[PDB]
Design a protein around this ligand. Structure first.
Ligand SMILES: [Fe+3]
Ligand SMILES: [Fe+3]
Ligand SMILES: [Fe+3]
Ligand SMILES: [Fe+3]
Ligand SMILES: [Fe+3]
Ligand SMILES: [Fe+3]
Ligand SMILES: [Fe+3]
Ligand SMILES: [Fe+3]
Ligand SMILES: [Fe+3]
Ligand SMILES: [Fe+3]
Ligand SMILES: [Fe+3]
Ligand SMILES: [Fe+3]
Ligand SMILES: [Fe+3]
Ligand SMILES: [Fe+3]
Ligand SMILES: [Fe+3]
Ligand SMILES: [Fe+3]
Ligand SMILES: [Fe+3]
Ligand SMILES: [Fe+3]
Ligand SMILES: [Fe+3]
Ligand SMILES: [Fe+3]
Ligand SMILES: [Fe+3]
Ligand SMILES: [Fe+3]
Ligand SMILES: [Fe+3]
Ligand SMILES: [Fe+3]
Ligand SMILES: [Fe+3]
Ligand SMILES: [Fe+3]
Ligand SMILES: [Fe+3]
Ligand SMILES: [Fe+3]
Ligand SMILES: [Fe+3]
Ligand SMILES: [Fe+3]
Ligand SMILES: [Fe+3]
Ligand SMILES: [Fe+3]
Ligand SMILES: [Fe+3]
Ligand SMILES: [Fe+3]
Ligand SMILES: [Fe+3]
Ligand SMILES: [Fe+3]
Ligand SMILES: [Fe+3]
Ligand SMILES: [Fe+3]
Ligand SMILES: [Fe+3]
Ligand SMILES: [Fe+3]
Ligand SMILES: [Fe+3]
Ligand SMILES: [Fe+3]
Ligand SMILES: [Fe+3]
Ligand SMILES: [Fe+3]
Ligand SMILES: [Fe+3]
Ligand SMILES: [Fe+3]
Ligand SMILES: [Fe+3]
Ligand SMILES: [Fe+3]
Ligand SMILES: [Fe+3]
Ligand SMILES: [Fe+3]
Ligand SMILES: [Fe+3]
Ligand SMILES: [Fe+3]
Ligand SMILES: [Fe+3]
Ligand SMILES: [Fe+3]
Ligand SMILES: [Fe+3]
Ligand SMILES: [Fe+3]
Ligand SMILES: [Fe+3]
Ligand SMILES: [Fe+3]
Ligand SMILES: [Fe+3]
Ligand SMILES: [Fe+3]
Ligand SMILES: [Fe+3]
Ligand SMILES: [Fe+3]
Ligand SMILES: [Fe+3]
Ligand SMILES: [Fe+3]
Ligand SMILES: [Fe+3]
Ligand SMILES: [Fe+3]
Ligand SMILES: [Fe+3]
Ligand SMILES: [Fe+3]
Ligand SMILES: [Fe+3]
Ligand SMILES: [Fe+3]
Ligand SMILES: [Fe+3]
Ligand SMILES: [Fe+3]
Ligand SMILES: [Fe+3]
Ligand SMILES: [Fe+3]
Ligand SMILES: [Fe+3]
Ligand SMILES: [Fe+3]
Ligand SMILES: [Fe+3]
Ligand SMILES: [Fe+3]
Ligand SMILES: [Fe+3]
Ligand SMILES: [Fe+3]
Ligand SMILES: [Fe+3]
Ligand SMILES: [Fe+3]
Ligand SMILES: [Fe+3]
Ligand SMILES: [Fe+3]
Ligand code: NA
Ligand code: NA
Ligand code: NA
Ligand code: NA
Lengths: 175, 180, 175, 180, 175, 175, 175, 180, 175, 175, 175
C-alpha cells in the first residue's frame, strides 16, 4: 500500500508540516463523511419526492445533491493535499459520519426535508468551527475553501427552511 | 397510372428501394406507426390545451412542464410521420384526419380543473405507451431495427413524461392544514 | 447646475421641440416614479416570501423586479433624451409616485402579491394612455417604447393574477 | 401574538434556528447590515442618476462605467437585504425608508457637471467603504464568518469602483492646449 | 431585363396592389438612398477619426455604419417585396439621395460629426412621415419596420449630439 | 412511511404490473448498488492517483466517476418509476453490492486500476443479462436504458484496460 | 510488431473472449472499409459538384462525408477495443471494401449521386445484419453503436434519394 | 498651411512615421489600394443588388450566398480603406467618388435574370482578382510585407467567391426533362 | 464523364490559364496524395496507441489527423478550382503518394511516431518548394494557402519530435 | 514624473492613510516581484519541457504561468490603488525578488519543477504573513484579495508536488 | 543541464539544419526580449494611467499587453522549436532587449504613450526584416508567423498614434 488510512504525512510543496496538517485533515475528513451521507440522502429525496410541488423540489434537491458532491470533492482533495487519506467506501463514509441517516423507508416530503435541514445544521456548525481552526493554524487556503463551501451549504439549508414555512397560495376554497 | 394528379394516395405504401424495405414488410410498420402518429398528435394538442389553461398555486411549474411535454410529443410525432414517409407510406396530416384516426380519448372543448386534465393525459400516455411497446417488437421481428430503435428512443421520453404526471397526482404536499 | 429639475429643453438632435417634449416628459417622469417604487416593492417581496411556493415566487418576483428596473431605465433615459430631468433620489421617487406603497412591515404572500397587482394595474392604465398621448404628439419612438414595456408589465401582472386564482394540487387529504 | 396581521414587524430580529444564530448575536449584524443596505441603495440611485445624465467628451465611457457601478451596488444591496432576512431581521424596503435610514449625502434633484457628481459619489463610496470594514470585524468577532466573508467579497467590488472614480478625477489627460 | 427601374408591380402574395404599393416604394426608395450615403459617410469618419477620443469614436462610428447598412437592407428588401426596384449603384444612390454629402476632403471630428447629425435629422424626419404614410395606406408591416429602424437611427443621432455637447473631464490645469 | 424498502407497487401510468415490475426492480436495484460503490472507488482513485501519468488519469477517473453517478441515477429513478424503493444510504449500498471494494488503504495506480477493471467486468456482465431480462419482460424502455448505459460503462472499462497494457514511450535510455 | 493484421486477442477489460470477439471484428472491419471508401467518394463529389443546386449539394455532401468519417472512427475503435486490428492504409481499405468505387473520372451529379446511393444501400443492409449478429453474440454495446450509426447513414441515403426524385420548381417557361 | 480647414486633402499621402513608411514608398501602395477600394465597393453594391433581386428555384440558396459575398467585399473594402489611411493617404468615400474611381463595369439600374447578373459579377471579380495579384507583388517589392500579407488574405476570400459563381453557372443540374 | 483525370482546363473566373495552372495542379495533386496517406496513418496510430502516455497521444494524433484532412481538403479544392481533377479513391491516393506507408501490422509507439515524422518531413520539404513555385507563377492565392497549411503541418511534426526526445519525469526509482 | 518609485501617498477614496498604506504597499510590492519572476520561470519550463509527460506538463505549466500573471496584476493594481508605485521593469522585478531564479541554462524537468516548488513555497509563506498584516492593519480588502490568490498559488504548488511523488504506471516490464 | 543558453541544435522533425536555424533563432530571440520588455511597459502604463480618458486607455493598454505576451510566446516557442534556447529571466530579457525602458518613475500619459510608440516602431522595423530573413532562409513557417504577429503589433502602434493626434471633442468653452 502507498498510504495507510489514518496517516498524515503533511506536504512539502504546500509547506505544511504533518503536525499542523493532521489537525485540519481530522476536521476535514470528519466533514467529508457528513457531506457525503448528506449527498446520498438528498439524492434519495430527489428520487422519491411526489406531490403538488414535486417537480420544483425534484430540481431543487437535485442541485442540492450536486452542491454536496462538489463540496465533498473539495474536502477529499484538500485532505489528500495535506498528506492525509480521505474516507472512500460508502461503508466507511456512513460509519465516520456523525449525522442522522434515514432507514431505507420512504417518508412524506415534510419529514424528509425536516431531516435534511437537521443534517445541514450539524454540517453548518461543524464547518464554522473548522474555518476558525484553519485560520488559526495559519492555513488560510483551507479556511477560504471552507467558507466558500459554507456559503453554498447555508443557502441550500435556508431554502429547505422556506419550503417548510407556514404559508401557501392554496386556499380552503380551492381545496 | 400514367394519368393521375396526386403523387401518392393516402393508404398506399410503396416501400423503399433505398432502405431495402419491401412494401410487404413496410406496410406492417406504416400501419403501426401511422396509428401512433395520430394518437401522439392529439396528445400534443391536449397537452397544449392544458398548458394554456392551467391555473392555481402550482400553475407556473405545470405550465413549463406541460409545455415541454407538448414539445416532446411534437418531436415524437415528427419522427413517426417521417419514418412512415420513409417506408413509402403517407402520414396522416389534417387535424380532422388525426383525431379521427386517433384511438384515445380527447376532451370536449370545455376546461376542467388541473387534476382532471392531468388524469386524462395520463390515460392517453398509457395507451400510447402500451401501443408503442408492441410496435417495437413488431419492428424488431420484421427485421426493421431502425424503426424499432427509434420507437424505443421515443418511448423512453414518453414514459418519463407520463411518470411525471403520475407524481404530480400522488397524495403528498408541503401544504399543512395550519398554513391553510 | 447644468439642469434644473422640472426644466425640459427638448432636443434638436431628435427634432423634438420643448413644447411637444414637455408633454411626454411629464407623462414619462410620472411613470418612472411609479415603476421604481414597484421595483422596490417587488424586491421586498422577493426577499421576504416564505412558504411552500417560496422558491417559485422568489425567482418570479426577482425577474419581475428586474423587468421593472429595465422599464424604469428606459423611461428615465427617454426623459433625459427629450431634454428633461428624470426623478432620481429614492425620496423623490416615492414622493412623485401615485401608487400605494406598503409600510415597512411584512405581510403574508397573498396580501403582498395582491398589493403588487394593484400597483401593476395603475401603471398599466397610465401607460396605455401615455402611448396614445405619444402617438398623437407624433412621437412614435416614445410610443413604441411604451408599448414594448407595457407588454412586459402586463405579463407580470397576469402572472400574479394566476398565482392568486382559486386552484391547487393540494387536497384536504394530503393536508 | 396569535392575533396580528403582519408576519413580521420592522425592527424585529428573531434570529435563525437553521443557521444556528441566536437573536442576540443576530441583531448586532442585522443592525449593521441594514444600515449599509440603505446607504448602498441610495448609492445605487445616485449612480443611476449620473448614468442617465452624464454628457460631454468622455460621456459614453462614463455612461458604461456608471451603469456597471450601479449594477454592482444593486447586487451588493441584494446580498445585504437577503443576509438580513436570513438572520431573522426585516430589511428596509420602501424608497422613502431607504433614504431616511441612509447616513450619506444625496444630491437634490438638480443636475451638476460630471466632476461634481463623480466627486459626490466618491464621498458616498468612502463612507460605505469605512462602515463596511468595521462591520466585517464585527461579524468575524461575533463568530459570524459567513456574513464577514460576504461583506469582504462585496467590499472588494465597492473599493474598485471608488478607485476608478478617483482615477477619472485625477489631473491628467491626452488633451493638449494645442488640440483645443 | 426582368424588371425596369421605376416600375412597381405590387405583390399578390402580400395582397398589396400596385396602387398602394407604389406610394410606399417611392417613400422607401427615397430613404434607401439617404441611408446608404449616410452609411458611406459614417464609414469615412470611421476610417479617418483621430485624436484623444479616437478609439471611442472609431468603434461608435463603426457600429453606426453597421446599423445604417442593416436599415438600408431592410428598406431595399421591403421595396423589392412590394414589387419595386431598389436603387443599387453607388452613383444612383448618391444621385437619388437628398442629403448633404461631404466632398472627398477630410475635416476635423467636430465638423464631420456635425455633418452626420445633419444627415440623421433629415432621415429621422422623413421616416416619421413615411411610417404615417404606411399606417394610413394600411401597410402595417412596412410601418412597423420603419419604426423599428427609426428607434435605432434616433439613438445614434442622439449619441452624436452628446459627443458634441459642451462638457469634458479635461481641465485647463491638465492641459 | 410512504413506502417500505423491498416493496414494489408497480406503475399504473407506465402500465407495468407489480408482477413484471418486481423482476426488473430486483435486477436494477442490484446494479444500482454495484455502480454506486464503483462511483466511490473511482472517486477514491481520482483523489489519490500520483505519478507521471497522474493528471491524465486524474481527469479520466473523474469522468468515469461522473458516468457512474449518472448511470446510478438512471437506475434509481427507473426503480422508483417501476414502483420500487431504490437503495439509498451508503451503508445499504455497500451491503447490497456484490463487487469487491478496497479497504481504506491506498494502493499504487496499477493495483487500483486493476481492481476497478474487476468491478466494471461484473457490472458489465450483470447488465448484459438484465437487458435481456427486460426485453423479455416486454419492458423495452428499461432495456433501452440499460444498453445506453452499458455502452458507456464498457468504454470506461476498455480505457482502463488500455492503461494497463504493456507499452509505453518511455525507454530504458530516458530512464 | 505489437500486433498482426488479422489477429483478434479479444478483451479482458470488456470481458469479451477472442472467440465471440473475432466474429464482430470481422463484421466491423468489413464495414470500416466500405464506409471509408464511401467517405472518399462523398469527398470527391463534394469537391466536384457544379450546377444550379451546386452549393446546396456541396454542403450536404460535406456533411455526409463527415458522418461517414465519424462512423468509420467508431468502427475502427470498436475493432481495436475488441482486440482486433482495424484496416488502415488507403490501399488496404479499398481492397477490403466490397462496394463499387468510381474510376478517377468526373461524372455529372445525377450519376455520382446515384452511385453513392448504391454504396449506402450495401452498407445499410450489411449493417442491419451485423447489429443482429452483435445482439445475438450478446455484445449489446457494439449492437447499440451500429444502430446509432445506422440511423445516420439511412438519413443521408434517403436525402440522396430525394435529390434524385422527379420533381422541381423549374418550369419549361422559366427555361 | 497654417491656415486651412480640411485636416487632409484627397490625393495627398503623408506616409507614416509610426509605421516607418516614407511618403515615397507609401504613395505607390496608396494608389494601388485606393484603386481596389473603389472596385470592391461597387462590387459590394452590385452583390447587394443581386442579393435583393434574385428569384427562382435556386433563389434562397443564392440569396444567402450573395449576401455572404457582399459581406466579404465590405470587409475587404474596410481593410483597404484602413490600410490607405494608415499609410497616410485619404480613402475614397462618397458613393459618387467610389463609382467614378472604379474601373469595372456596373449594371444600369435595370434588373436582369440571375445568369446574366451572376455572369456580370464574375467579370468584376476577375478584374479585382488580377489587379490584386499585381498589387501584392508591388507591395512585397516595396518592402511593405504587411500590406502584401493583407492583400493575399483578402485575395484568398475573393477567389473563393468568384469560383463559387463559376460553379453556379456550370452546365449541370439534377433537373431532368422528365421532371419538367 | 464531365472531366478526365489528368486534364487541367484552368479557370476563366480566376483568370488562370491552363498553362500556368497545370504546373500548380501537378504540385498540389502530388501533395494531396501524401497528406491523405498521412491522414490515414495518423488515424491508425490514433486508434492503436497504448501505454502510459496513451491518452495524451490519442488526443494529439486525433488532432493531427484532423489537420491533415483539412489541409487535404484545401489542396483538393484548390486543384478543382484551377481546372484540375483531384485524386479521389483510396487506391489512387496511395499509388500517387510518394511517402512510406506502414504495412497493416501494428508497431510500438516510438516506431510509429518515428515513421510519421518521416512522412511529415517529406511533405514539409515538398510544400516549401511548391509555395515558391506558386509565388513565381504569380499565383499568390495558392502560395498563401500552402504557407497557411505549412505552418500547421510543421507544428504537428515538431510535436512528434518532442515526444521522441530523450527526457522524462520517470525515474529509475519510481520504476 | 507624476510619481516617484518608493513613494506611497495612500488613498482618500479608499479612506486609507499613507501611514497604514505604506505597510501594505511594501508587503505587496515585495510579492509582486517574486510572483513575476515565478511567472517567467514557469513560462521558461512551459516552453522547454520535453519527454513522455511533456504535453501534460506543457498545459499545466502554461496555466500556472497564467495564474501567476493574474496574481501579479492583482498585486500591482492593489499597490497603485494604495497610492504606491508597483515595480515594473524586468530588471527591477528580478532585483527586488527574493527567490532563486535559474541561470539561462535548461535543466531536466524534475530539477526545474523542483526549483519552482521552491519559489512557490517562499511566496506561499510570505503571503500567509501579509494577509495577517493586512487584516491587522484593518485593510480587509487587501487581506481578502491575498487569500483569494493564495488559494490558487497553493493548488499549483501542490500539483507540482504530486508530479514529483514516487509513483507511476510505468513498469520495469514495459521499459 | 539539458541545453545551454546560446546553443542551437536545429530540428530533425522540422527538417531544419542548425546552420539555417541559428540565423532565425538569433533574430527571433532578439525580438522575444524586446517584446517582453514591451509587455512589462504596457502593463506599467496599464496600472498607472489616470485622467479623463483613463478607463478607455486602461482597457486598451491591457489588450496591448496581452497581444505582446502572445507574440512573445510565439517567438519563444518558435525558438525552442528550432533547437534554440529562448531568453527567460526578467534580468536576461531586459539585458538582451535593445529598446528604451523607462526608469521606475511614473510619467504623464502622453509621455508614456510616446515612449511605447517608440518601442513599437523598433520592434516593427526589426520584424519586417526578420520575415524577409525567414522567407529567404526558406523557413516559410517562421516567416508566416512573424507577419501574423506583425499585423497585430502595427495595429496597436497605430492606435497609440491616434491617441496622440491633435484633436478632441473638448472645447475651451466646456473647460
Ligand atoms: Fe452530481
Ligand atoms: Fe455532476
Ligand atoms: Fe475532483
Ligand atoms: Fe478544487
Ligand atoms: Fe499527495
Ligand atoms: Fe468564490
Ligand atoms: Fe397561460
Ligand atoms: Fe416546437
Ligand atoms: Fe420543435
Ligand atoms: Fe421534421
Ligand atoms: Fe427527424
Ligand atoms: Fe419518399
Ligand atoms: Fe438518444
Ligand atoms: Fe428568502
Ligand atoms: Fe436587476
Ligand atoms: Fe441604462
Ligand atoms: Fe436603454
Ligand atoms: Fe442630454
Ligand atoms: Fe422588444
Ligand atoms: Fe443617456
Ligand atoms: Fe440589474
Ligand atoms: Fe441585476
Ligand atoms: Fe435577489
Ligand atoms: Fe444573493
Ligand atoms: Fe425567513
Ligand atoms: Fe468571489
Ligand atoms: Fe483609424
Ligand atoms: Fe457592416
Ligand atoms: Fe439582406
Ligand atoms: Fe431583412
Ligand atoms: Fe420579387
Ligand atoms: Fe426589433
Ligand atoms: Fe400513498
Ligand atoms: Fe489530486
Ligand atoms: Fe458527479
Ligand atoms: Fe436525477
Ligand atoms: Fe433521468
Ligand atoms: Fe421518479
Ligand atoms: Fe431526473
Ligand atoms: Fe413513484
Ligand atoms: Fe443516448
Ligand atoms: Fe441513443
Ligand atoms: Fe500486451
Ligand atoms: Fe471530416
Ligand atoms: Fe472533422
Ligand atoms: Fe477517435
Ligand atoms: Fe466512440
Ligand atoms: Fe487494445
Ligand atoms: Fe445516441
Ligand atoms: Fe429578397
Ligand atoms: Fe455587414
Ligand atoms: Fe460587417
Ligand atoms: Fe472598420
Ligand atoms: Fe480592419
Ligand atoms: Fe492617420
Ligand atoms: Fe487569415
Ligand atoms: Fe462541361
Ligand atoms: Fe483507442
Ligand atoms: Fe476529421
Ligand atoms: Fe471542403
Ligand atoms: Fe475550403
Ligand atoms: Fe470547387
Ligand atoms: Fe469547402
Ligand atoms: Fe470547377
Ligand atoms: Fe489563417
Ligand atoms: Fe492568416
Ligand atoms: Fe536529446
Ligand atoms: Fe498629481
Ligand atoms: Fe513546446
Ligand atoms: Fe497570460
Ligand atoms: Fe489589470
Ligand atoms: Fe483587477
Ligand atoms: Fe489602478
Ligand atoms: Fe484591472
Ligand atoms: Fe492612483
Ligand atoms: Fe474568488
Ligand atoms: Fe471568493
Ligand atoms: Fe513517496
Ligand atoms: Fe496576459
Ligand atoms: Fe492571458
Ligand atoms: Fe504557450
Ligand atoms: Fe503557437
Ligand atoms: Fe525541442
Ligand atoms: Fe491568421
Ligand atoms: Na402547492
Ligand atoms: Na510516464
Ligand atoms: Na434547381
Ligand atoms: Na477626453
Amino acid at each position: 500500500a502507498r498510504a495507510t488510512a489514518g496517516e498524515v504525512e503533511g506536504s512539502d510543496a504546500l509547506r505544511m508540516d504533518a503536525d499542523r496538517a493532521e489537525q485540519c485533515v481530522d476536521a476535514l475528513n470528519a466533514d467529508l463523511a457528513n457531506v457525503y451521507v448528506l449527498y446520498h440522502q438528498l439524492k434519495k429525496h430527489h428520487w422519491n419526492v411526489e406531490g403538488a410541488e414535486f417537480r420544483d423540489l425534484h430540481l431543487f434537491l437535485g442541485e442540492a445533491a450536486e452542491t454536496a458532491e462538489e463540496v465533498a470533492d473539495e474536502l477529499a482533495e484538500r485532505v489528500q493535499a495535506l498528506g492525509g487519506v480521505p474516507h472512500a467506501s460508502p461503508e466507511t463514509l456512513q460509519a465516520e459520519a456523525s449525522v442522522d441517516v434515514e432507514d431505507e423507508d420512504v417518508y412524506d416530503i415534510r419529514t424528509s426535508l425536516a431531516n435534511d435541514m437537521a443534517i445541514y445544521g450539524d454540517i453548518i456548525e461543524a464547518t464554522r468551527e473548522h474555518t476558525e481552526l484553519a485560520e488559526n493554524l495559519g492555513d488560510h487556503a483551507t479556511a477560504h475553501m471552507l467558507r466558500e463551501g459554507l456559503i453554498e451549504l447555508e443557502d441550500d439549508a435556508h431554502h429547505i427552511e422556506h419550503y417548510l414555512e407556514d404559508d401557501t397560495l392554496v386556499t380552503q376554497g380551492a381545496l
